[PDB]
Amino acid sequence: GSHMWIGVISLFPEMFKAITEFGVTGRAVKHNLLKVECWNPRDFTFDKHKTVDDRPYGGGPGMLMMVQPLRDAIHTAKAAAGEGAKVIYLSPQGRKLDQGGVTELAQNQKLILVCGRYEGIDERLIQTEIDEEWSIGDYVLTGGELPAMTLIDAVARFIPGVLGDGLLDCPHYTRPEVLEGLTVPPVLMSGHHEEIRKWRLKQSLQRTWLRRPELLEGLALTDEQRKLLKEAQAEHN
Amino acid sequence: GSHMWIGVISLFPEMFKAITEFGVTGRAVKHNLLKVECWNPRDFTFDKHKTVDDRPYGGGPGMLMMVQPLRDAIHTAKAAAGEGAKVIYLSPQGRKLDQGGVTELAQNQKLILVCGRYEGIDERLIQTEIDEEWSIGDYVLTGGELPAMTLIDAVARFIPGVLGDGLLDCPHYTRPEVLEGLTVPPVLMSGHHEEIRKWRLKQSLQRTWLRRPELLEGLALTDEQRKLLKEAQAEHN
Numbered sequence A, B: 001g002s003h004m005w006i007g008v009i010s011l012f013p014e015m016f017k018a019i020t021e022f023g024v025t026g027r028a029v030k031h032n033l034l035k036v037e038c039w040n041p042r043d044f045t046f047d048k049h050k051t052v053d054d055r056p057y058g059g060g061p062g063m064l065m066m067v068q069p070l071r072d073a074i075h076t077a078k079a080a081a082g083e084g085a086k087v088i089y090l091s092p093q094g095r096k097l098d099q100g101g102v103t104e105l106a107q108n109q110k111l112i113l114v115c116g117r118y119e120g121i122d123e124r125l126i127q128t129e130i131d132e133e134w135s136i137g138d139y140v141l142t143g144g145e146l147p148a149m150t151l152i153d154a155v156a157r158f159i160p161g162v163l164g165d166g167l168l169d170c171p172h173y174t175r176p177e178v179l180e181g182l183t184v185p186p187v188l189m190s191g192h193h194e195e196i197r198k199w200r201l202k203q204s205l206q207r208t209w210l211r212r213p214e215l216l217e218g219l220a221l222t223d224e225q226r227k228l229l230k231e232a233q234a235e236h237n
């Protein structure tokens, strides 16, 4: 397809089996729609104990990733990727990821994802080796690998063949018709496709309004959406 | 310690090896600080082909998780957890996770995390079985497992023994003293601990201001922070 190649720099490359061996992303990898290739800084060490961390200038409680093995791993990944690969560092200081940013990143045929461990990486590597810094959210994790997998999974959905509008999703129902006394909305069992579409759209608008009203502000609603949202708000009242 | 038990409902429980076998979280599991226990809806099916998906009332392109195997898995997890376990559903319709929300969730000694696959789960299960709905971010993934791991990793950092303020982190430097012509800030090599603290704090304030100014609004800065931020903004200008 419009396949995608993703190079990964990580001290724990076996974590990536979570996305390359299972589910939709695992199928994408098996079918060569997505290729994920990993380089481990530990393999670029030269000392007997394969040291991959180092002490921060200025002191402090934590450790940083050691520059030489990480730099060399990045350079090796860049040589494999050839031309046009954007190098991304995952960190809380990066641009916050949202679906618009996923769609942007998915325009790349090649990406290299650098996964930090310990307290961080040297600022000068960010300056010299990293094209873009991205955050998956405003919380603190133990490593960049889950953010990198999250990003891979989100962009993989855009690859042709991998899968078979600003608003939260509508409620979904499946069997049984009655579950702990709770019935399926009759409209969903009416077979009236236009009423079903409008009902779902109205529910998405209502849920976005009630839970995430700030998302509504960023939208230019269609006439139909304005009407259904007004109906929901009148109903709710 | 103040150990934590996390029950997980997932069609792909082997994904969780990414956090239970590696790094800081893997150590937490080995040392019994964190226990992660998984139940797979597929094991609660009764038909020959172990069906775990089902068709949405009202039609549409996708499938939902089948109610009976998922319900039964959840009930089994709840019986294992005993009293006091909060059941969390990960989805884009949930409360957006941030570090304050992580600290809240970390107050729980027990959690059960329900990981959705396909297009979603039946709304009535959310109503009847789920205590809280949380989102790890405003993007769309192929399953709830990476969000659940992300949440586990973030809350694990709060468990006593697992590890050895509103602002973005400061830059970090390690060896070598000179890297591609770029030098380490002399203050970090001065050994003056108070100047180093103030420099780091000033950098965090400057970076938050330049990259994420909306985060600054949510803070009541100390006198010292107000002064250093003013200095940074004058400097920047």
Ligand SMILES: Nc1nonc1C(=O)NC1CCNCC1
Binding pocket: A090, A091, A092, A116, A117, A118, A119, A120, A134, A135, A136, A137, A138, A139, A140, A141, A142, A143, A144, A147
């Ligand atoms: N949030 C994040 N989006 O990307 N990476 C994130 C993250 O928490 N990284 C951790 C930062 C502390 N050092 C270990 C890595």
Ligand SMILES: Nc1nonc1C(=O)NC1CCNCC1
Binding pocket: B090, B091, B092, B116, B117, B118, B119, B120, B134, B135, B136, B137, B138, B139, B140, B141, B142, B143, B144, B147
């Ligand atoms: N963002 C999220 N925060 O928690 N879960 C998220 C998510 O994208 N879930 C996918 C929604 C589409 N169906 C597959 C699961």
